[PDB]
Amino acid sequence: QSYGFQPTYGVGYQPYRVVVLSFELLHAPATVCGPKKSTNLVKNKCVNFN
Amino acid sequence: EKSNIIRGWIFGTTLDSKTQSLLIVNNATNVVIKVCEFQFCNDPFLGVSEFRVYSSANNCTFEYVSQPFLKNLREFVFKNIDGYFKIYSKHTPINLVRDLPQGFSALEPLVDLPIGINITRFQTLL
Numbered sequence A: 001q002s003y004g005f006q007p008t009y010g011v012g013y014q015p016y017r018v019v020v021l022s023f024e025l026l027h028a029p030a031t032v033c034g035p036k037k038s039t040n041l042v043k044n045k046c047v048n049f050n
Numbered sequence B: 001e002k003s004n005i006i007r008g009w010i011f012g013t014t015l016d017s018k019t020q021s022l023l024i025v026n027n028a029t030n031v032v033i034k035v036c037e038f039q040f041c042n043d044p045f046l047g048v049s050e051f052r053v054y055s056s057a058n059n060c061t062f063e064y065v066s067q068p069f070l071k072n073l074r075e076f077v078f079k080n081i082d083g084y085f086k087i088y089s090k091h092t093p094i095n096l097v098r099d100l101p102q103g104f105s106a107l108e109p110l111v112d113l114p115i116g117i118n119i120t121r122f123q124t125l126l
């Protein structure tokens, strides 16, 4: 059955876009990640490098 | 290599609407690596146009684009370990015209591909 959408309809019946994202568990090589850090560089000092 | 009439790889395990199948072709533009599943023919001769290697796609998981692989020798190593496929290469002129010469030439890896499909056979195209 078709929805009835009008600009004057109630807020409860107003359209709403819902996007649901689901990620599968760890069973394969990882393919999705994110930008962690963007730190700068120093020289001739005792530092901990990663 | 010389006169060639070579290039074109078709890998896989099954041959009938099952699993997936790799495909590597060189056309001086892009070394596309399509894992997409199709059906095939006996000797599909493309180029000079006509294109009838594949039959029907269902669904695919990897699309790749890279630079083309250019008395020589065309040497490749295809090796798969725990879902990672590795293809190495080398190209060097030689003086001997008879067979594989006497010499040493290590293979610099060219690509690493995480896929995770078991493979059992392969075939070369022309």
Ligand SMILES: *[C@@H]1O[C@H](CO)[C@@H](O[C@@H]2O[C@H](CO)[C@@H](O)[C@H](O)[C@H]2NC(C)=O)[C@H](O)[C@H]1NC(C)=O
Binding pocket: B027, B029, B030, B032
């Ligand atoms: C060599 O092969 C590659 C891969 O098949 C071709 O790359 C395609 O180029 C078209 C041009 O717009 C794109 O729309 C496609 O998405 C590209 N990929 C594929 C898989 O088709 C390339 O065009 C070919 N070069 C020549 C000269 O034919």
Ligand SMILES: *[C@@H]1O[C@H](CO)[C@@H](O)[C@H](O)[C@H]1NC(C)=O
Binding pocket: B058, B059
């Ligand atoms: C998609 O891939 C799955 C792999 O699990 C396969 O079973 C299926 O036949 C493919 N095609 C469609 C339309 O689902």
Ligand SMILES: *[C@@H]1O[C@H](CO)[C@@H](O)[C@H](O)[C@H]1NC(C)=O
Binding pocket: B116, B117, B118
């Ligand atoms: C087929 O691929 C699956 C994917 O993980 C793997 O578990 C299985 O061992 C493969 N089959 C063979 C015979 O290696």
